[PDB]
């Protein structure tokens, strides 16, 4: 019938839009994990540096 | 007669040298500097990033102690301290011999000291 056409113009948009917004809610969240990981990768190198420098200084000093 | 061609290169921490000229042991390489130009800045970079290759050349010389010698021939108030504080960056002040000549020091010792 004619009401069955109407349910199909909607039922198409409301999956196109909600599939799109579940891949932005994916995407932001993927970059959020890859940032936190990298802000701790730079933190890891820094600490190392400070320890290699530190020990050399105490060897020279002594 | 007592020398022979060297061939063991070092990391100066400046790309440009270690490609184009290749700074090896027993070789000079003046760094020409103008007047109204820095001289101090650039020098410091070569002192804290001077290091042999571990086997990147096919060998090292890290197996024998690497050390540095200094001797300044006329220096002011800033150049005095500027050098000393980058030698603590270097971590070398227990294995270096410094022959600092100032400008408040005699002018005759500017050619003796070398």
From Swiss-Prot, chain A:
It comes from the Bacteria. Belongs to the V-ATPase E subunit family. Produces ATP from ADP in the presence of a proton gradient across the membrane. This is V-type ATP synthase subunit E. It comes from Thermus thermophilus (strain ATCC 27634 / DSM 579 / HB8). The lineage of its organism: Bacteria, Thermotogati, Deinococcota, Deinococci, Thermales. The chain holds residues 3 to 64 of 188 of the full protein.
Curated annotation (Swiss-Prot), chain B:
Produces ATP from ADP in the presence of a proton gradient across the membrane. The V-type beta chain is a regulatory subunit. Belongs to the ATPase alpha/beta chains family. This is V-type ATP synthase beta chain. It comes from Thermus thermophilus (strain ATCC BAA-163 / DSM 7039 / HB27). The lineage of its organism: Bacteria, Thermotogati, Deinococcota, Deinococci, Thermales. The chain holds residues 122 to 235 of 478 of the full protein.
């Amino acid at each position: 019938k004619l009401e069955a056409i109407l349910s199909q113009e909607v039922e198409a948009e409301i999956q196109a839009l909600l599939q799109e917004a579940e891949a932005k809610a994916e995407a932001v969240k993927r970059e959020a994990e890859e940032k936190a990981k990298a802000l701790l990768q730079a933190r890891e190198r820094a600490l190392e540096a400070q320890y290699r420098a530190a020990l050399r200084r105490a060897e020279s000093a002594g | 007669v007592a020398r022979r061609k060297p061939e063991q290169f070092i990391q100066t921490g400046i790309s440009t040298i270690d490609v184009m000229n290749t700074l090896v042991r027993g070789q000079k390489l003046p760094i020409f500097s103008g007047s109204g130009l820095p001289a101090n800045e650039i020098a410091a970079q070569i002192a804290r990033q001077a290091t042999v290759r571990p086997d990147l050349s096919g060998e090292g010389e890290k197996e024998e102690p690497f050390a540095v010698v200094f001797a300044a021939m006329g220096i002011t108030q800033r150049e005095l301290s500027y050098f000393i504080q980058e030698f603590e960056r270097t971590g070398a002040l227990s294995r270096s011999v410094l022959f600092l000549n100032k400008a408040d020091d005699p002018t005759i010792e500017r050619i003796l000291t070398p």
